[PDB]
Amino acid sequence: AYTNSFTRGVYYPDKVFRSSVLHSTQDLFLPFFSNVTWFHAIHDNPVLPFNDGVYFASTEKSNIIRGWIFGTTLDSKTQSLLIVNNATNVVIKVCEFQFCNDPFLDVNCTFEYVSFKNLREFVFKNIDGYFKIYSKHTPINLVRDLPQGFSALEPLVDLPIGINITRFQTLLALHAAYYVGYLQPRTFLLKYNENGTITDAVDCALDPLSET
Amino acid sequence: KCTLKSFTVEKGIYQTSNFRVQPTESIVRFPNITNLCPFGEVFNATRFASVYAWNRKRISNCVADYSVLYNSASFSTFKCYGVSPTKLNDLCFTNVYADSFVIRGDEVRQIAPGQTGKIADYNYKLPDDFTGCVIAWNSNNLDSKVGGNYNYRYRLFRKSNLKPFERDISTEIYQAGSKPCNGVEGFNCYFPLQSYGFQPTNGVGYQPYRVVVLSFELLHAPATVCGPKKSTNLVKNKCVNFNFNGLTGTGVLTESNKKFLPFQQFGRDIADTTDAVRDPQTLEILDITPCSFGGVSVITPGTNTSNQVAVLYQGVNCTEVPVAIHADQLTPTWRVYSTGSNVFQTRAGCLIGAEHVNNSYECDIPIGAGICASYQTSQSIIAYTMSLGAENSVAYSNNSIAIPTNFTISVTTEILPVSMTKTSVDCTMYICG
Amino acid sequence: TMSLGAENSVAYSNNSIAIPTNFTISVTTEILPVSMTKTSVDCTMYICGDSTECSNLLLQYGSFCTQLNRALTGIAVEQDKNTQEVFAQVKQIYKTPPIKDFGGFNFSQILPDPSKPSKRSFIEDLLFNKVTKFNGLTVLPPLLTDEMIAQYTSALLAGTITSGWTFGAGAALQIPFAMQMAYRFNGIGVTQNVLYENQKLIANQFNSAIGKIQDSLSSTASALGKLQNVVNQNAQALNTLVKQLSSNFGAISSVLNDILSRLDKVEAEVQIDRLITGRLQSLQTYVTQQLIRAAEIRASANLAATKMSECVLGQSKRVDFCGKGYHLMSFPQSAPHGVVFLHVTYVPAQEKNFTTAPAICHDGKAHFPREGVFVSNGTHWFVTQRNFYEPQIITTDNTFVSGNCDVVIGIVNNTVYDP
């Protein structure tokens, strides 16, 4: 089930305030007008490839998407990143083991940590073993496909966990819809406003006008 | 005079280069961190791991006094890249990573940027733009045994480099032959964890040496690993040397209203240089400038006529001039050019040492935006709005004409340059001779 | 494929002439740059910026830094020279005359507006609407404010209206404006009665052409493309010079305090010398571009100063120098970084064909026209001024004689009357 990103998937590239400037940068972005895969809560959460990094988003009002699994092979044999919102907390670990095997909340782990009215956007990438998480939450009222418009994801976390991740899966709540797409090395032009905030972008490689 | 390299200065205006002393003072700001870093384990444990499968530790949130290691010059080498080792107690970092192992003393060569060899290839790679340090020492007395310490291992074969700061453990037959070895060992088809035969009687190069590599993460994220530096009080609204977590500068620290997002640690100018910071103790956002800069230009009669002189501070208001020059830290004969009653606000900047006048005259020395200055009566430098020449009013009406009854035959000089000095330069005799 | 223009066969023969039966006045607008922004640069504050450690290395390069600051100071001074040479051509501030009875002409658009805060004209105020720094770089104000410039354009204009040429050659002489235009018509070879017999019509054409200029300037800012280039080029050059501070030039950072904090002097000097070399070459590149660009703007300022003297302070005989058609008059209006001329010109407007011959036989004498041309309407012959059809009977005064009928090619027979 295909659809498209249009203009989604921008994030703050570095931890600096800049104001009233057209800064430009090269990074692993979701390309403008790139295709993406749609899903909804049935069976629609098999294992998926992670590639260079994932754009992930869900349209919800009650948190039906609860978490994610990531790894080489997700197998009880080598370290797998686990992420779980458990309502009281957001919970993170790197275990191999399927000590809970369920692909949902029921209606040697070198690192652990704990913290359609809504659209949650998440970006997952990994540079030199430093895993990086970005997100945005926004209210919406929306069709079956991503809102054609602009907002920039802030970083949530950096984790030095070093895993050779190539595959991933998402955890639901069972006894809503979501989207998946992939980052590419791209050069972007970014519009920082008077208040330190990114408000627009251009993907230079998109077309002859964007090169201009 | 020093700007012009001359004892005489002609009438005019001159943009002085800065010779003022402004001796300044220093301010220091750091996190409240007190946990001592575990270097006394990392440099001192009973064994370090095999160079095939080196030890690693992320270090965070600690006081890193490297002076113990700097004084312990019994280390056979302590070499740093992108940092001089002297700076490590004054500089500080977001993260540090320590890698450690034992290797043959001859073969320690491989542990640097730009190196080659079977370990540099297959089982430990630094990036060639590595920032940090390698420390190593002879460990023959500890790490040599039997003539057969075959635990200290390297890849015999396989293909492609291990990448910068990758780890590999993998345990397989390596297929060196044209043969489909495919799980079966033989000649050119072999398992690959070959290793040193360290006798305690080995000659110097054949002995084991211990190694530590420190990699330093200088990111714009918050600092956590920092030297034994002590924070001062925070001075504001004075020219100071300053240091925030090792981010140095000299300038005026002030309070600020820059609307940083919670994760934004610094603010940057168009030049891609820091111009605002978050205090690591106070969490206040401070602004920065250089030491209260403003363009000092001197208005003067000729020194041939008077030594009396006036100053234009380009691009400042007269309320702020003493804080521009830092009159707190300046020569008295210079200091007189703040306040002093003869101080006047032009559109170009504050003018001090000139007597303002309500009349208008032709422009003797130009100051800017219709203001000019001249030397006049008992003498002073005076400053005035310039004349555009006299007003006149033609007696126009629909039936009146004026006609000249007489004439004068003027002779008007005009001067034009037509040529300039012909030259040639023998480049070899100029450059070399 | 672009077209060069519409094709046209001129209807030539050995004996046909076309004469205009009517005219039109026009007010073509011309725009010139005069002075670019007065920048100045404190080169040690750019190159090193408040480091003693770097400044003592920059001293090893000697007088490079001072000869660059001198070169920019020379550029910055000559911007006021350009502005002086173009506008200050009148030695006095002639103030605007009280009563505006200029024979039907209406200058209220171009004379100063007393209700504007800076007393620009109405058109000068449109021109000021259609046209739109930190790291040791600086910008300096011009010596003459936009209000002082508006006094000079007002003075030049009030002199031009009340006194014509005369305020350039000597003291201004008052003259009625319908007399000034009659002499300017006579200067383009059109007999002065052609103005007086048509004065109200001429004034309505002038007033209408003034009206069209407000509309024209109000329609798009691209009318000021020359002056907007002067601004954009200088802003682009400064952004380039500033943004080069972020470049590495092969050093381990572009931020000088990184090197100074991470390295000891003997190591740091090798890095800082790359940044000094790179920044100094980048500043030399900016100053060299500004020197070459200053010559272009100065060539424009001297051309503007020439049109000021030859066309505002007089009338120009020089073909196409001051508007197309035969030049009558010009009015200057100020604008940001430049000047604008409204060139008032005469253009012939309604051609009619006539038969013609170079001379006329009478008593075997050949007669030639004293002024103007012989023409015929097919039944009679006349003499006319060359630039406006005004047929007069051929007579012993409006002709002169030379030789006899035999010599001239294409001569014809017609009785010259004697008054």
Added chain:
Amino acid sequence: SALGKLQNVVNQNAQALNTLVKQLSSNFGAISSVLNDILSRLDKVEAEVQIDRLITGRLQSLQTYVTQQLIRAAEIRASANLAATKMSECVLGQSKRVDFCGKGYHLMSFPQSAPHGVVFLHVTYVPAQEKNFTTAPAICHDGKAHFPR
């Protein structure tokens, strides 16, 4: 002080040459700016590095002088083209061009030579001693309008 233009054309060339000479004393990061010092203190493999700094700096200085002289030569030529025009139009003629051949109405001009330059003595008629009069554009006689020749 009247001959300021010509005196300045002399001063700029002396100032340029003095600047070009003074830069021979600058180090450009070498151990000395005097080339015989490098050649006498150091062996060739090391001396070459220091000499190449001096070559790099001195060559950059000499290209700066020639670039400045090319730009200044065009500025003098722009003035020579104007003087060549005033010679042909004002001396060899009489000029209708307002304020070209001096202020007032032009009569005549005389060239005089000067160092690096030329001087014109423009002779010009300037009117004086005005009177007011009443005036009218035309005159009526026999009901015809008469206009002045």
